[PDB]
């Protein structure tokens, strides 16, 4: 710092409108404002906090579930457990991605494939496969929850119908995330600069449909419970239904959050809400699965 300039005394500079004369593939002159750079950095800082939260959430729900379980060895326990372990592993590899050479400011501003190196594409593929090993956990948690919900004393017509439709929908979504993943692969390896997000988007719609369906089902069960307990029950549920509606016993909150996800800013680095729906669903699976594995009438 041999000397400053009068520009430093200017109280109304407002940096954010200035220029960066960087070098790109399009040439050695490419102006960009500090505000766009800071927004690109705030997208990374905004999408890192949520996956740190997910990693810590799943890590500290795994230990609690492990140590507190009164009864173990039931399929739903291991299923939710391995779901949270795939959450932790997905968050780990997504932290690797965030600090990797694909989220770097260099590739964003400067579309130079030479910065990219092989193996990072293997980490991208691995993450896209881990998302499928997570949705598979969720869906083999939900069919193995419906199979306990509707069975036994209940009628085998509504129950078989509900299980059939949920199983068909779930296998269909898993086949969607996969073909999506493979198509994304065949491109990211064919050409690093390409993208394929349509099938990802339709898969997210279909998962939102899966969780909306499960929530609709468990509120239908709540209506049926209240109706039966009114016929000749022990005074019904006295001030005990206040929780069930929206206290994460049911899947209402993720059903709202997915829907509010699309009504945000046009991707101002914040795709958080859809990252919140999956965490809240996988963390609420124990409560709904212990809500469904109940007598429901006495």
């Amino acid at each position: 710092a041999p000397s400053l300039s009068n520009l430093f005394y200017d109280p109304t500079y407002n940096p954010g409108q200035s220029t960066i004369n960087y070098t790109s593939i399009y040439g050695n002159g490419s102006t960009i404002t500090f505000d766009e750079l800071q927004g690109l950095v705030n997208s990374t800082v905004t999408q890192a906090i949520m996956f740190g939260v997910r990693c810590g959430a799943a890590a500290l729900t795994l230990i609690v579930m492990w140590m507190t379980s009164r009864s173990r060895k039931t399929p739903i326990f291991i299923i939710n457990q391995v779901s949270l372990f795939l959450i932790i592993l997905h968050s780990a590899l997504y932290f690797k991605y965030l600090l990797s050479n694909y989220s770097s400011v260099t590739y964003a501003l400067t579309g130079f494939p030479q910065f990219i190196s092989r193996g990072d594409v293997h980490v991208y593929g691995a993450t896209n496969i881990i998302q499928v090993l997570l949705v598979a956990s969720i869906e083999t948690s939900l069919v193995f929850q419906i199979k306990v919900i509707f069975t036994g004393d209940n009628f085998k017509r509504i129950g078989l119908m509900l299980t059939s439709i949920s199983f068909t929908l779930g296998i269909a979504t898993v086949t969607m995330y996969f073909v999506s993943a493979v198509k994304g692969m065949i491109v990211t390896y064919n050409d690093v600069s390409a993208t394929q997000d349509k099938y990802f988007n339709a898969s997210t719609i279909l998962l939102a449909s899966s969780i909306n369906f499960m929530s609709f089902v468990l509120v239908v069960k709540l209506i049926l419970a209240i109706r039966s307990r009114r016929f000749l029950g022990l005074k019904q549920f006295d001030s005990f239904h206040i929780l069930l509606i929206m206290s994460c016993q049911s899947l209402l909150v993720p059903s709202i959050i997915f829907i509010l996800a699309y009504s945000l800013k046009p991707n101002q680095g914040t795709d958080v809400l859809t990252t919140v729906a999956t965490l809240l669903a996988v963390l609420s699976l124990p409560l709904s699965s212990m809500w469904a594995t109940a007598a429901n009438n006495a």
Partner: peptide, 13 residues
């Protein structure tokens, strides 16, 4: 509302 968008190497949420 808007479609979700993925960066050229952003894996699935």
């Amino acid at each position: 509302w808007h479609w979700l968008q993925l960066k050229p190497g952003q894996p699935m949420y």
